[PDB]
A paper describes a structure:
By introducing DNA annealing as a site-specific and directional driving force, cohesive-ended nucleosomes can promote self-assembly into well-ordered lattices with a variety of possible configurations.
Extrapolating from this system, we next wanted to test whether lattice formation could allow discrimination between two different types of cohesive ends, so we designed a non-palindromic version of the 169a DNA, in which the two termini are incompatible. Importantly, this demonstrates that the pairing of the termini can be DNA sequence-specific, allowing for control of the directionality of the inter-nucleosomal base pairing interactions.
Residue numbers in the entry:
A (entry chain C), B (entry chain G): 14 to 118
C (entry chain A), D (entry chain E): 38 to 135
E (entry chain B), F (entry chain F): 24 to 102
G (entry chain H), H (entry chain D): 30 to 125
Write the structure that this text describes.
Amino acid sequence: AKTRSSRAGLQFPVGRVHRLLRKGNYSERVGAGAPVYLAAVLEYLTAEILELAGNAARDNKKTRIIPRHLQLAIRNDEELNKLLGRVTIAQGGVLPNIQAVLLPK
Amino acid sequence: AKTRSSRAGLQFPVGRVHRLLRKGNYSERVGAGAPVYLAAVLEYLTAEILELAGNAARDNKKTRIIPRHLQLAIRNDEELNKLLGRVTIAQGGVLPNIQAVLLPK
Amino acid sequence: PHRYRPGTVALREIRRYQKSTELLIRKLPFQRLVREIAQDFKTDLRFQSSAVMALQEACEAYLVGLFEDTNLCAIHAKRVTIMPKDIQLARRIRGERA
Amino acid sequence: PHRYRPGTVALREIRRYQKSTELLIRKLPFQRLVREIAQDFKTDLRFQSSAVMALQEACEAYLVGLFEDTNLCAIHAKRVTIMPKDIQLARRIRGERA
Amino acid sequence: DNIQGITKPAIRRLARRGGVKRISGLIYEETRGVLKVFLENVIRDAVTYTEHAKRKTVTAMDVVYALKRQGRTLYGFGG
Amino acid sequence: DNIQGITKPAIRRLARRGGVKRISGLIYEETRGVLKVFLENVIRDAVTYTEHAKRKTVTAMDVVYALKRQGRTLYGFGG
Amino acid sequence: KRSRKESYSIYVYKVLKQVHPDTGISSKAMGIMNSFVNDIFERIAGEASRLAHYNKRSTITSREIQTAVRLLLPGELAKHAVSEGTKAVTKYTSAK
Amino acid sequence: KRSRKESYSIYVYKVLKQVHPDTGISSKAMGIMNSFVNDIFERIAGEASRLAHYNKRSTITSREIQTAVRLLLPGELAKHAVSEGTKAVTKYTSAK
DNA sequence: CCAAAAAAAAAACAGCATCCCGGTGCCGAGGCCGCTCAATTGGTCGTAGACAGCTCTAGCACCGCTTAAACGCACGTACGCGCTGTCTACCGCGTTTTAACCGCCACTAGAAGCGCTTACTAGTCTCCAGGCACGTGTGAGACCGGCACATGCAAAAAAAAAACGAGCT
DNA sequence: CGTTTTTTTTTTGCATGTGCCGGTCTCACACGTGCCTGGAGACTAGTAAGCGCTTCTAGTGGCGGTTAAAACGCGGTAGACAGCGCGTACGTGCGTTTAAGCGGTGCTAGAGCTGTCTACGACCAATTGAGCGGCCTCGGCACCGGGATGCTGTTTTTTTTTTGGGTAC
Ligand SMILES: [Ca+2]
Ligand SMILES: [Ca+2]
Ligand SMILES: [Ca+2]
Ligand SMILES: [Ca+2]
Ligand SMILES: [Ca+2]
Ligand SMILES: [Ca+2]
Ligand SMILES: [K+]
Ligand SMILES: [K+]
């Protein structure tokens, strides 16, 4: 016995995802592709954040990602910012931004 | 002489709602009171708008409520306008409302 | 030789259209814009008549509400004339743009 | 004795707090206010410390965002001072307020 | 360029419903830009709903479903 | 004066993160009112959740469910 | 053909005649009223659904529909609605 | 012992090490990454859930997860996300 | 032009904050372990939906009138905006007062878990009328005269509120 | 106190829109009809969840010292804001141009419906290893002090703008 996730080339639990789709009252029946596809997408998006979030942390001179790194990552990427435009990241603060008219001459 | 609507004292089909609830992938099982309680709330809110829409109709010497009457009813009421703050009513126009500063002296 | 002062007819137009509920874009030039915009995504696309009506009801509703907000912005600047920056501030606060 | 021109510290303070992520409201007062406001909905209520922190992370985020949108309204009126009418316009256009 | 079919006189009428009394000359080109994006962002989703149902005709329901996702729910086309 | 426990200098800090450089004295009280109407609207819903779960303790998840409802989804406290 | 497309429009007419028995309703208005009931059906049903799921229960009861209405309807509307719905449940559990 | 609180955190760590092998993650930063997976899970699932009900179909297939992703994810994110899913399924269908 | 007075420009100069480095110490990320329950496997059975074929709805194209609406130009008023100038609100920093914060201990509310038990809802097969489509009627309302009527502007009616004797203390 | 001007304000004078009657003609709301499918019913069976009972988590309250944060007051600059003044960008209103809107016909893509048939996913029981809770450790990172650096503000000096004479029509 080897996991669906091993077969599909993913790090994300295809098994777990399948269960959550049945138990989540989304549809009567769940196809076999569905959880594999959904797992892949969650993994892809998870990769994209941790990619930029890592770079954020490296630029701080820090080993471990912290919420701010995730925030700097998300708010500076145009599309990730739009995807999470109605989402508050605890302990993330805000991007450094001072309106030009407020700086001295 | 019986029907689940008339036992609860309603004009909204308690049966229809109980089936919509089962078939609409919300929960495994639907309690007998749920579709009663719901039909009641949908009726009560429909009455509330019709009441005020027919008070905007009778205020135009109109026998028949049109979209504009519904809009007028919903926007001039603070609570209804909130509940439907993100809805557009088609052929509904906008409340007569001019900013004081744009008027003449 | 009669001449209404600048902004007198405007207040009439405000009053006139705020009273009514008719679409204020000419339907054919709009429909054409729909099909043009549509083409980009998928070619040889048909539209229900109602579908193009739903899209114009929406587009107009949206634009009237933006002018509402855009107006408040102009008033806030102690002006009476809506300008691009008025729109841009309405949309930046609305969340529609960065 | 040395003295900074009005707003040079303000600019400094901006830079300081835009760099950091710490909650800026004192925890105990905020928690009291959370309990006060709760008693309006139900008496003898208990709160998970996370539930209080969740609410403070939320309010603080909301307010910072509101001050950003406020500050834009002020600049739009060719000012540099935020005033209650910058906050009122901001919330009106957001659709928090009638 | 059927966007130009959205005429100054038509934009002014929308503005007027929107209680506007006076109007910069730059607004008409601005307003067209905003309109195009609005229709792009709605239609793109409408046509996605068309494609999934495997149709060649955009239905009113397609637009209704799209408008609801853009947070612009529309009553009286099949809501 | 629990609401005053939200000190002038706290609000002033919040605005600096907001990148505000100058602050009318009327803002501090205005700000107190906005904040009160914010917690009221969340804690209301928050507690409605606590009630329905038949609990006397408000849980972070209650808050989280409440913020998601108010269109203010929060990350890093569950959900 | 023409499907057999179910509506609310009879149960709307059966409420319009009760509040304002003199005055009627155009189609476009009845369409906006059909949209309305469907919207709010989904809002309430949807929240009840989550309410259930959060609390690890398998059944949507009148209690889930109640809390859902408390969360979704503003001040006065939420009270009156609770009542009419508590009223209708009691009169139904009377009537066998 | 304490009851079982499930989490995506072992898979987040896996992906992180693929992308940045020498990089760690705070407990909070992990909680954010969890909120994130569950958020988008619900968003895609629900949009799929709807797509199915709209087209009178009992089954959420991979095709529903795809259309859901083209609706939800902005531009390039949707394309890349759609590919990754389409790869993942193909590869899963070949091994059986 | 002439010449003088500011208003900006550059310069040097003390000063205070911020940033970077190495050193220290604590704790939480990280990883290991052992048990557990959720995912996997392999089996059977039912039905959702894929597909082929047929119906006919309504989306498209085209045409030819009649305006209603777009367009373009002339002209001038009222607005946007730049400039200046005045008053103090708001910023900075100091000294004084407060209470948050921290760490800790003590007590127990109530969150949460488990076991039992049964009332409640899902599932099924039979029945049938409420609610559907389809189709015809008829009166509301939109349309189109003209007729008060209200406005709202071009002023002249006069009528108040200042600028200047007034002429005396 | 009056007595010239101005500065405000009152009442006509037409010219433009809505607001309003009477007819009055069409199409869409309204209701009736007949037929189909979705709600009703009584049944069985299983289990979801209410309840009672037990566990021990973590939420609450109190205390006393430290010091960072709030407070409150003094002072002065820089911003809000009111007024003025200038140039033209918009609004109004024609006369000219356009093409949308209307009603109609003719053609067929494709929306949508039906019946058939099977590949697919639900459900089941057995099997077991992935992933969880708990537990341990050790380096990343928070904290601190010390020195280097950068940026601010003041006072002095330089540079140019800017402004109040001294002749001409
Ligand atoms: Ca009947
Ligand atoms: Ca009739
Ligand atoms: Ca007429
Ligand atoms: Ca009449
Ligand atoms: Ca077909
Ligand atoms: Ca293992
Ligand atoms: K507890
Ligand atoms: K380590």
